Amino acid sequence: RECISIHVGQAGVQIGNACWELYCLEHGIQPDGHVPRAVFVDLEPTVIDEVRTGTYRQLFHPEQLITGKEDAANNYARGHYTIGKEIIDLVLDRIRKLADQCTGLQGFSVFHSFGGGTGSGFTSLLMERLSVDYGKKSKLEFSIYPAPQVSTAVVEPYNSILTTHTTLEHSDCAFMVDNEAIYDICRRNLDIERPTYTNLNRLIGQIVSSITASLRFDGALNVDLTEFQTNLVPYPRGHFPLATYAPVISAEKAYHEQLSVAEITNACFEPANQMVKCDPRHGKYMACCLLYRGDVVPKDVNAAIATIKTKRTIQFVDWCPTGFKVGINYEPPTVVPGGDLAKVQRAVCMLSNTTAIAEAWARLDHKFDLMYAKRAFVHWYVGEGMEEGEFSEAREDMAALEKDYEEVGVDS
Amino acid sequence: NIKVMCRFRPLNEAEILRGDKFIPKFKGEETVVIQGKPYVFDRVLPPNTTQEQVYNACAKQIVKDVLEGYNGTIFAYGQTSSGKTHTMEGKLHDPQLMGIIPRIAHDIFDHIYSMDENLEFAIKVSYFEIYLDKIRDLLDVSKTNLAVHEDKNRVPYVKGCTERFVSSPEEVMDVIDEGKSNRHVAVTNMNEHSSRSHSIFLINIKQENVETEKKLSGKLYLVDLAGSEKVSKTGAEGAVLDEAKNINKSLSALGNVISALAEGTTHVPYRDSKMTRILQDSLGGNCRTTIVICCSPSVFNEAETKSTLMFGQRAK
Amino acid sequence: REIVHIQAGQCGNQIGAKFWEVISDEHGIDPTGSYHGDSDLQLERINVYYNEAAGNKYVPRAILVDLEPGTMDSVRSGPFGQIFRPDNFVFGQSGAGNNWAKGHYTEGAELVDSVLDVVRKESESCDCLQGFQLTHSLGGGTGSGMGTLLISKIREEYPDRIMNTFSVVPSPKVSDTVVEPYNATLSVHQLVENTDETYCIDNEALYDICFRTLKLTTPTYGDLNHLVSATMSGVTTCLRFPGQLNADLRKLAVNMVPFPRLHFFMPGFAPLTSRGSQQYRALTVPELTQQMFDAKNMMAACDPRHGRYLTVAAVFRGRMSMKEVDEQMLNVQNKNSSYFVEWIPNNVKTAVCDIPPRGLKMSATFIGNSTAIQELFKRISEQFTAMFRRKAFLHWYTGEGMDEMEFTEAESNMNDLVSEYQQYQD
Numbered sequence A: 001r002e003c004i005s006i007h008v009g010q011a012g013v014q015i016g017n018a019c020w021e022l023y024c025l026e027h028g029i030q031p032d033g034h035v036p037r038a039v040f041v042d043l044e045p046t047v048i049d050e051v052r053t054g055t056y057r058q059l060f061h062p063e064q065l066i067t068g069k070e071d072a073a074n075n076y077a078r079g080h081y082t083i084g085k086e087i088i089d090l091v092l093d094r095i096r097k098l099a100d101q102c103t104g105l106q107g108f109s110v111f112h113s114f115g116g117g118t119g120s121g122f123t124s125l126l127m128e129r130l131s132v133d134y135g136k137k138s139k140l141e142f143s144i145y146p147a148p149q150v151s152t153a154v155v156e157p158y159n160s161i162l163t164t165h166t167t168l169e170h171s172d173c174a175f176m177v178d179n180e181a182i183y184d185i186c187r188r189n190l191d192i193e194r195p196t197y198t199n200l201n202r203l204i205g206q207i208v209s210s211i212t213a214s215l216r217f218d219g220a221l222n223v224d225l226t227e228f229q230t231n232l233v234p235y236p237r238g239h240f241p242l243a244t245y246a247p248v249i250s251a252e253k254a255y256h257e258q259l260s261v262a263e264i265t266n267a268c269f270e271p272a273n274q275m276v277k278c279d280p281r282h283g284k285y286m287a288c289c290l291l292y293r294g295d296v297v298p299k300d301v302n303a304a305i306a307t308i309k310t311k312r313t314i315q316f317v318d319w320c321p322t323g324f325k326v327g328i329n330y331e332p333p334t335v336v337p338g339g340d341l342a343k344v345q346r347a348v349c350m351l352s353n354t355t356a357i358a359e360a361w362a363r364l365d366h367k368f369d370l371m372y373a374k375r376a377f378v379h380w381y382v383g384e385g386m387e388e389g390e391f392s393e394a395r396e397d398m399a400a401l402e403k404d405y406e407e408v409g410v411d412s
Numbered sequence B: 001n002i003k004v005m006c007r008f009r010p011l012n013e014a015e016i017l018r019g020d021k022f023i024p025k026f027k028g029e030e031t032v033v034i035q036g037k038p039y040v041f042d043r044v045l046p047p048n049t050t051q052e053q054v055y056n057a058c059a060k061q062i063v064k065d066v067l068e069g070y071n072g073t074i075f076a077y078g079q080t081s082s083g084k085t086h087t088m089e090g091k092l093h094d095p096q097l098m099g100i101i102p103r104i105a106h107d108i109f110d111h112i113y114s115m116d117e118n119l120e121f122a123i124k125v126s127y128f129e130i131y132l133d134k135i136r137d138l139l140d141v142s143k144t145n146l147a148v149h150e151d152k153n154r155v156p157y158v159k160g161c162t163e164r165f166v167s168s169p170e171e172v173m174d175v176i177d178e179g180k181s182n183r184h185v186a187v188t189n190m191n192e193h194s195s196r197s198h199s200i201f202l203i204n205i206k207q208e209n210v211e212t213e214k215k216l217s218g219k220l221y222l223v224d225l226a227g228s229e230k231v232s233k234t235g236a237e238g239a240v241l242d243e244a245k246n247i248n249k250s251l252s253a254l255g256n257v258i259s260a261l262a263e264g265t266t267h268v269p270y271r272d273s274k275m276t277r278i279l280q281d282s283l284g285g286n287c288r289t290t291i292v293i294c295c296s297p298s299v300f301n302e303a304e305t306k307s308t309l310m311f312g313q314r315a316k
Numbered sequence C: 001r002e003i004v005h006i007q008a009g010q011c012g013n014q015i016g017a018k019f020w021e022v023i024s025d026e027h028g029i030d031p032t033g034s035y036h037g038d039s040d041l042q043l044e045r046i047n048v049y050y051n052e053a054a055g056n057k058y059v060p061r062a063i064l065v066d067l068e069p070g071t072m073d074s075v076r077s078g079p080f081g082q083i084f085r086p087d088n089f090v091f092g093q094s095g096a097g098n099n100w101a102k103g104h105y106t107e108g109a110e111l112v113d114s115v116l117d118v119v120r121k122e123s124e125s126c127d128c129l130q131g132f133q134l135t136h137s138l139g140g141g142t143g144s145g146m147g148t149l150l151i152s153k154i155r156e157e158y159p160d161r162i163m164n165t166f167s168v169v170p171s172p173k174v175s176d177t178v179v180e181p182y183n184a185t186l187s188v189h190q191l192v193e194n195t196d197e198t199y200c201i202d203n204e205a206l207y208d209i210c211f212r213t214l215k216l217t218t219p220t221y222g223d224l225n226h227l228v229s230a231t232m233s234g235v236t237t238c239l240r241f242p243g244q245l246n247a248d249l250r251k252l253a254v255n256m257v258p259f260p261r262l263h264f265f266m267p268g269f270a271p272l273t274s275r276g277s278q279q280y281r282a283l284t285v286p287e288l289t290q291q292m293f294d295a296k297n298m299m300a301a302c303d304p305r306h307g308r309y310l311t312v313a314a315v316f317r318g319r320m321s322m323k324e325v326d327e328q329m330l331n332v333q334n335k336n337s338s339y340f341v342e343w344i345p346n347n348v349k350t351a352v353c354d355i356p357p358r359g360l361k362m363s364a365t366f367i368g369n370s371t372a373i374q375e376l377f378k379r380i381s382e383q384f385t386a387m388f389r390r391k392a393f394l395h396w397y398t399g400e401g402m403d404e405m406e407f408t409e410a411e412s413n414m415n416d417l418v419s420e421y422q423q424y425q426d
């Protein structure tokens, strides 16, 4: 029934504090109410401390807040092997102590930031140690993969080609939200050149609320977590769909809010609104899980979608007749009291697997090579319990992820 | 130029009853196919290939160059039970069973004696290990932290390394045995060769032409490489983790050096490790280098053998 | 986490006074007083630089190494001078001769053990150690020689913890000493092989940046020092603050050093506007990157425009949009694709603290790893040869128990170091 969550890496923790905020906010549980149902991991104390100093301070148990005073290191190796190792046990312990206390759970919604040290590496083995300790569950990892041109870390790819290959054979469904492609939404669909990280977080903090929160919440067309991976992954590769939200209108500027279904659903497939720089440049969808929430008439959907199924310029895979999982919830969304989110009475958090990422992975793989081609910051990992193996052998890994996402599509 | 040579050993009794199947498929005399992907090298020696045939192709030309006053280097790489000991030393006193080192030493002393007319020979040996990034003399237990220095012509050399005079093939073997007893190895239960450091054996062939007054000094470096360690597996901690990082760093450095030399780069990163700086003079210029990689043909070793194969590919 | 500063030599020392002059105020620590901190955040992470004893006395955890009493006796007899526990003062009343050899082999070598002693008392302080900060000048005895030894020993004692080095490489135009390239070439040598992050500052790159970027007409040393200390605060201490995207010495190290040499950087501060007038506030952000990335404004002597970059780390510290930050960085990376090296898709390492420099609204430390610094070690290396060739003031070295092969060594080494760095400019 439930779904634990492990927010790993400063980012996964910032986003965590955010997604965790939106929660109580739409459940009437102020600062000090019940008890969360997740944990927080980081090898840099000062960040988890922000959850220990700032807002939502006492809504957590100093037990579900793991820290390694030591060093973060923007390098996979160190975070996965060398350092990150020391903490893992302890980490697990909570996701085994928190996993017990419950009643027939469904899985762990993992929150990490692909291209980091504590986020890429660590998790790599966290999800790793999970796939074995609970192979019998769902492992949906919600990632924030590398901005297409606006990356931060100098190494980023090293850290992301490595978190992909190690987690690939362990996740159930990996959701992806592109940090940059979300900015566009903040520039083009909300207008603000002042987007603090605290915003992107409010956003995913939204799209995510549509996943677990409301879905695990009764409705006219419930959709379990398992449901996802089933209706969402055509193949064992921990396939990565993309998150998209519909009413991303500004709560100040424009106001046409009352944008009946027929509109908000069409607003999902236009590439300028998908929290991912993977513009459907060719990527044929192969399965979409249209999660609606608020006042929505099933016919409105079983029509708004029909209209789409016949737009053709939206070309769905061949081997897939119908790939539209319509998830209907009741309670409308719940916007921050005064952030910058419109606040409509219905939304569409559609996520999907698109042959599109054939790109995004490509462009991120290429990156890697360029540097590896010169070993660049390699000495930083080797000296951290890794080898020419793990790199070269994780490169070959993704290689067959560029072929995979190519074969499962583009061909009939 | 640099040459990479792969050697597959036959299957042993300890793995015959294990029911492992031969994953090693061969092509020509230079290619080895593992899981439908080819792996081209300068030469691939199966299991039927003799110690004599292995030596002639990998070491014989380097020995002639050293006796002619030039430098040369021989690297031996492989995981535990790959065949390093058998390939490099074998049955040290048996004529057929003997490896690479007794043969080099045989050929050197066969050139010596045969030239006693105007020539005066001096054979100087040195043996050191790089352990935890420190140069430890294996011939003097008191010299645990030797430093690499440069002469007036920027040539790196190991300062204060023991230089033992050797007048016979047996003297060289005794020196190798003495040094081996000083190497950082772990007490392991069943197996001869498992190390936690890289080993460098130096054979310096000095000659003075009494009448011509002209002198030659050729350096032969015999490098014993500890295998790359995946520290996630093994679960190495403390000093063992410091050992594993140091072995891995050194192999990366070495790979970076051979790759640069193979591509004919103007910059060769000898400064990446103390090992590559000790070998700088013998790796650069008019010097032939052979990397001998030993692997197993077992289906269980497919991971560690593909690891040994990719290291050889790095050299090229 | 933690670190333990090291004030090697006079310069490195003089600067200590300025680095601590600042940092303290950036942490509300009065002379011997405690935390008057205008806020409450300038305390949760102090540990990085202090120690708890009394309850109002958080003492800087640095080391003051010098063979010239008068110096430390000027730093200890002035302003904040009375905050260091006397135990910190590792003096060498000997003759602090201006010889690298006199402070590395003969005179300093003695005072070393009585230093390492303390560098251990401070390291074994508490919690977990990160690394050590090292200030000094590569143009003297107690600086290049003795300080360059202090590290060679440190890096044998904890090859785990990091080593940032703040070196005052010998300014071009005019040398404030004569053997300079001797004391220098010899110390850079030691650097390229122990510390793993070096921030090279030039007394004349500062003047310039301090007399034209600060209409400041009488730039006393105190100033230069002050400006420098401003950067080293943005680096360390800063990142030991919260941030949307924070990093720490390692991130900085693990994102900036592609190849083990250690490589040296060139720090640059953000808001560098003259007092009254200039107080333009054009600091939205494009103004900071405008700043940081220009030629002038690079504490180094060389000009970036003269050689690609390998890595860059804009360590900003003041509330801003992870969008207008992450974005700007890009255009910057495209307007100058020319010089920014290619085999690194994203050279830049954007870092973002929250709280800014006490009295300012928005700043951003710049730590550049450009190939341009090739044209400096060249300089140094040249000066050497031109004088080595004639063994100029060599008797002051050898006569102190040195070697004719020692100088050879260093030059070459550091000389090769120039070579390599070009391997990427191409």
Ligand SMILES: CC(=O)O[C@H]1C(=O)[C@@]2(C)[C@H]([C@H](OC(=O)c3ccccc3)[C@]3(O)C[C@H](OC(=O)[C@H](O)[C@@H](NC(=O)c4ccccc4)c4ccccc4)C(C)=C1C3(C)C)[C@]1(OC(C)=O)CO[C@@H]1C[C@@H]2O
Binding pocket: C021, C022, C023, C025, C026, C214, C222, C223, C224, C225, C226, C227, C228, C229, C230, C231, C233, C234, C271, C272, C273, C274, C275, C276, C279, C357, C358, C359, C360
């Ligand atoms: C009224 C007002 O706003 O005054 C400003 C001011 O006028 C200006 C000109 C300051 C001023 O700085 C200088 O004039 C200066 C003098 C010598 C060397 C270098 C700089 C200032 O003195 C410096 C001072 O800086 C700080 O307070 C920072 O926290 C800074 N602190 C110190 O350097 C410091 C100085 C004395 C004692 C202890 C610390 C800092 C910067 C980075 C990391 C840590 C701390 C500031 C904003 C100002 C004055 C006071 C006039 C500027 O410098 C800095 C470092 O902020 C010079 O250009 C900037 C722009 C500022 O607006």
Ligand SMILES: Nc1nc2c(ncn2[C@@H]2O[C@H](COP(=O)(O)OP(=O)(O)OP(=O)(O)O)[C@@H](O)[C@H]2O)c(=O)[nH]1
Binding pocket: A008, A009, A010, A011, A012, A013, A014, A015, A043, A044, A072, A073, A074, A075, A079, A112, A113, A115, A116, A117, A118, A119, A120, A144, A146, A147, A152, A179, A197, A198, A200, A201, A204, C244, C245, C246
């Ligand atoms: N949406 C969103 N992205 C974030 C947030 N914080 C960081 N990121 C992104 O995630 C990545 C940053 O990871 P870091 O904060 O460096 O590291 P970490 O994953 O927390 O773990 P360490 O490297 O060990 O500190 C970058 O790509 C950021 O753009 C956040 O609050 N929201």
Ligand SMILES: Nc1nc2c(ncn2[C@@H]2O[C@H](COP(=O)(O)OP(=O)(O)O)[C@@H](O)[C@H]2O)c(=O)[nH]1
Binding pocket: C008, C009, C010, C011, C012, C014, C015, C096, C097, C098, C137, C139, C140, C141, C142, C143, C144, C168, C170, C171, C175, C176, C177, C203, C221, C224, C225
């Ligand atoms: N920025 C700066 N440079 C200094 C200071 N003091 C000396 N220097 C520089 O240091 C060099 C001289 O070395 P010095 O510090 O006297 O050596 P030592 O005292 O014998 O170790 C000259 O290049 C000076 O410009 C200072 O307080 N600040």
Ligand SMILES: [Mg+2]
Binding pocket: A009, A010, A011, A042, A044, A047, A072, A118
């Ligand atoms: Mg973090």
